[PDB]
Ligand binder design. Structure first.
Ligand SMILES: N[C@@H](Cc1c[nH]c2ccccc12)C(=O)O
Ligand SMILES: N[C@@H](Cc1c[nH]c2ccccc12)C(=O)O
Ligand SMILES: N[C@@H](Cc1c[nH]c2ccccc12)C(=O)O
Ligand SMILES: N[C@@H](Cc1c[nH]c2ccccc12)C(=O)O
Ligand SMILES: N[C@@H](Cc1c[nH]c2ccccc12)C(=O)O
Ligand SMILES: N[C@@H](Cc1c[nH]c2ccccc12)C(=O)O
Ligand SMILES: N[C@@H](Cc1c[nH]c2ccccc12)C(=O)O
Ligand SMILES: N[C@@H](Cc1c[nH]c2ccccc12)C(=O)O
Ligand SMILES: N[C@@H](Cc1c[nH]c2ccccc12)C(=O)O
Ligand SMILES: N[C@@H](Cc1c[nH]c2ccccc12)C(=O)O
Ligand SMILES: N[C@@H](Cc1c[nH]c2ccccc12)C(=O)O
Ligand SMILES: N[C@@H](Cc1c[nH]c2ccccc12)C(=O)O
Ligand SMILES: N[C@@H](Cc1c[nH]c2ccccc12)C(=O)O
Ligand SMILES: N[C@@H](Cc1c[nH]c2ccccc12)C(=O)O
Ligand SMILES: N[C@@H](Cc1c[nH]c2ccccc12)C(=O)O
Ligand SMILES: N[C@@H](Cc1c[nH]c2ccccc12)C(=O)O
Ligand SMILES: N[C@@H](Cc1c[nH]c2ccccc12)C(=O)O
Ligand SMILES: N[C@@H](Cc1c[nH]c2ccccc12)C(=O)O
Ligand SMILES: N[C@@H](Cc1c[nH]c2ccccc12)C(=O)O
Ligand SMILES: N[C@@H](Cc1c[nH]c2ccccc12)C(=O)O
Ligand SMILES: N[C@@H](Cc1c[nH]c2ccccc12)C(=O)O
Ligand SMILES: N[C@@H](Cc1c[nH]c2ccccc12)C(=O)O
Ligand SMILES: N[C@@H](Cc1c[nH]c2ccccc12)C(=O)O
Ligand SMILES: N[C@@H](Cc1c[nH]c2ccccc12)C(=O)O
Lengths: 65, 65, 65, 65, 65, 65, 65, 65, 65, 65, 65, 65
């Protein structure tokens, strides 16, 4: 399954999972400080991912700075 | 499934999910402040995505600035 | 499934879904103001998409300007 | 499924769906004025598409000017 | 399924569908005037396509002028 | 399925289908005059194709001149 | 299924089908005179093809002169 | 399945597996000293991976430094 | 299935099929005179092919002169 | 399945298999002397691989020196 | 299935099949004199191939000289 | 299935198969003298391969000298 790579360029970046289904709610958040990385899949329960704060993002479609 | 990457260049960007099926309405709007990103899939419930406001958008077919 | 990316270059763009099946009718029209984007799939209900107004379009086959 | 992208270069372009099956009949027509686009799939009902008038056409096999 | 793109360079181009099966005959002829285009699939009923008249032809294997 | 594109460079080209199975016989011969094209699939019935006369041929493997 | 393209560079080229199975026998031959072409598949009954005489041969692996 | 390659550039890197499902918890943290590498898959149990500390990361989408 | 293309550069080339299964023996030898070609598949009965004599050989992995 | 190639540049490299499943522990350590190589798959039992010591590592995503 | 191409550069090359399964034994050795080629698949019975003597080898991963 | 190509650059190279499953044991070794090659698959029984001694190794991921 598809995934995203998220690296914090500054402290306090939040990576938020949004629920799959008829409803769209916050189900989990991970905080990244500068330099920390999360590699996160889309899953049965997560169909959208929100990132708050300055991050470097890589997906199958390229880089989002 | 396919997805889209949307980064807000200005405050107040709305990323809107439109319902899959015979009927079409907005089922969710995620508001992004400047710099925030959403990576969102097409899903059982979402078959079109509308973006209002100045955003950087990436899909399987490249970039839309 | 395949999808199309449509960006309005000027106010008053309409993105129209045509019904899949023996009958062909417009089932939904989405208005886009300048700068707004819709990323829309072909679906069980939609097998053709009509775009009226000045728009930038991307598909698997490239760009229409 | 495969699809075609058709943009009218002049007013009065007609995009015509032809029936799949033993018989080949016109089952629907869409008119495009200058700059208007249709993105249309081949489907259960449609196995050939006819275009009358000056149009820019894109398919999986390239551009037909 | 595979398809062919045929554009008439002169009036009176005929695009002819030949029947799939043990027997081979012409089940349909679509006449194209100059500039008109047909995008036609191979199908349950059509396993060969004949073009008479001056036409620009595109397939999966490139162009035929 | 795989197909062949055949264009007659002179009058009197014949495109001949050979029967699939234990037995091999000509089941159909299509005459092509100069400039005429046939796009023909391999099928349940046809597992080899013979071309007589001066023709331009395209397949998945390239061009024969 | 895979196929081969065979063009006679001289008169009297023979293209011979060999049987699939425990036994390897000649089951059919086609004669090509100069310029004539056969496009022939491997099939349920043919698992090897022999060519006698000067021919230009194209397969998925390239050209054999 | 998809995997990640993580190399510690300094001592004290932690590679953390997050649980797949409705709940998201850290189920394992692997410490890496300078120069040590982990190559870790996404799995039935693990649907996101967090990396803390200065690390070189490679995925299908390229490198993070 | 995969195949090999073998052209005799000299008279007396032998193309030998070796049996698939626990036991290995030659089940067929096809003798090629200069210029003759065999295009031969791997099959239910043939899992290795031996060529004796000077031949030009092409496979999925390129040429062997 | 995916695999990794690991070559020891110094004596005492350990290649460690981590268990697939809810629990994570080290089920095997292969010690490599200088120049020795292990080519190791991900498997039913191994879903992460840890390398301690100076090694040259290759995976589907390139080299890690 | 995958295969290997082996050409003897000097007399006395041996191509040896090793048995698939819990046990590993030589089940067949084919001698190749200078210039002779074997194209051999991996099979139900053969899961490793040993080549002794000076040989040119081609596989999906390239050439060994 | 995936395979590896191993050529001995010096005498006395040992290629060792390690068992698939909960246990990781050596089940077979092949010795290669200078210039000798083994092409070995991963299999039901073998999920890791160890090489002792100076060898040239090729896999799907490139060359390991
Ligand atoms: N338990 C979550 C873990 C997860 C995966 N991707 C995420 C993105 C954001 C937050 C959490 C996650 C899930 O399986 O869906
Ligand atoms: N619950 C929504 C979440 C979602 C996915 N993609 C979206 C695009 C826009 C808005 C919401 C979404 C869904 O599963 O469909
Ligand atoms: N990328 C996957 C995510 C996924 C995993 N399991 C799922 C089950 C149902 C729907 C989606 C999923 C998909 O869109 O398919
Ligand atoms: N409810 C519509 C939403 C949609 C998808 N693509 C579209 C294109 C145009 C208009 C509406 C749509 C559907 O699932 O089919
Ligand atoms: N791209 C997928 C989206 C999707 C995921 N799960 C679905 C379930 C039903 C319909 C569509 C979906 C599709 O068109 O199929
Ligand atoms: N491009 C898809 C559209 C689609 C999604 N779900 C469907 C269900 C039925 C028919 C078509 C669809 C297709 O042609 O298959
Ligand atoms: N109802 C038509 C819609 C359509 C798709 N492609 C077309 C091309 C031309 C005209 C109509 C169409 C169908 O499903 O087949
Ligand atoms: N009814 C025809 C339509 C058609 C498709 N391709 C064609 C080519 C030529 C003529 C007609 C056709 C069919 O389904 O087969
Ligand atoms: N390109 C598709 C067109 C198609 C869509 N839905 C279909 C249903 C039946 C037959 C054909 C189709 C095909 O020929 O396969
Ligand atoms: N009825 C023939 C039509 C055909 C397809 N390819 C051909 C090539 C040559 C001659 C006839 C054909 C068939 O289905 O097989
Ligand atoms: N290219 C397709 C054409 C096709 C569509 N629907 C079919 C139904 C039966 C036979 C052929 C077809 C094929 O050879 O299969
Ligand atoms: N190229 C196809 C031709 C084909 C279409 N339908 C078939 C049915 C049976 C045998 C062959 C066919 C094949 O070799 O398979
Ligand atoms: N009836 C033969 C036709 C054929 C296909 N490929 C060939 C090559 C050589 C000779 C005959 C053939 C068959 O189906 O097998
Ligand atoms: N009857 C043999 C024909 C054959 C195919 N490939 C070969 C290679 C060598 C010799 C004979 C063959 C078979 O089906 O297997
Ligand atoms: N990348 C795989 C991970 C995986 C392996 N086995 C699984 C079983 C269930 C769910 C996920 C998995 C996936 O998303 O599918
Ligand atoms: N190239 C095909 C030829 C083929 C068609 N039908 C077959 C039936 C059995 C064996 C082979 C075939 C193959 O090797 O599979
Ligand atoms: N009977 C052997 C033939 C064979 C295939 N590849 C080989 C490599 C070496 C020796 C023999 C073979 C088998 O089917 O497995
Ligand atoms: N390349 C095919 C050869 C093959 C065709 N038909 C077969 C039947 C049984 C075994 C092998 C075959 C394979 O290894 O599978
Ligand atoms: N037992 C864990 C091992 C694992 C795989 N990938 C990981 C990433 C981080 C931490 C642990 C792991 C699992 O199968 O899921
Ligand atoms: N890469 C494979 C590893 C694997 C092999 N056999 C397995 C059995 C069960 C689970 C995983 C595996 C996978 O994730 O699927
Ligand atoms: N490369 C093939 C070899 C093979 C052919 N037939 C087989 C039957 C059983 C096991 C292996 C095979 C594989 O690993 O699958
Ligand atoms: N009998 C062993 C043969 C083998 C394949 N690859 C190997 C690598 C090393 C040693 C032995 C092997 C097996 O099937 O697994
Ligand atoms: N018995 C182990 C062998 C193994 C494969 N990959 C490994 C990586 C590290 C250590 C051991 C292994 C297994 O099948 O999983
Ligand atoms: N690369 C193969 C190895 C393999 C061959 N045969 C197998 C049987 C069972 C498990 C693994 C295999 C895989 O992991 O899929």
């Amino acid at each position: 399954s598809d995934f995203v790579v998220i690296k914090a360029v500054e402290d306090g970046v939040n990576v938020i999972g949004l629920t799959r289904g008829t409803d769209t709610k916050f189900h989990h958040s991970e905080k990244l400080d500068k330099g920390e990385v999360i590699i996160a899949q889309f899953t049965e329960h997560t169909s959208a991912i929100k990132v708050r704060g300055e991050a470097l993002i890589q997906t199958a479609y390229g880089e989002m700075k």
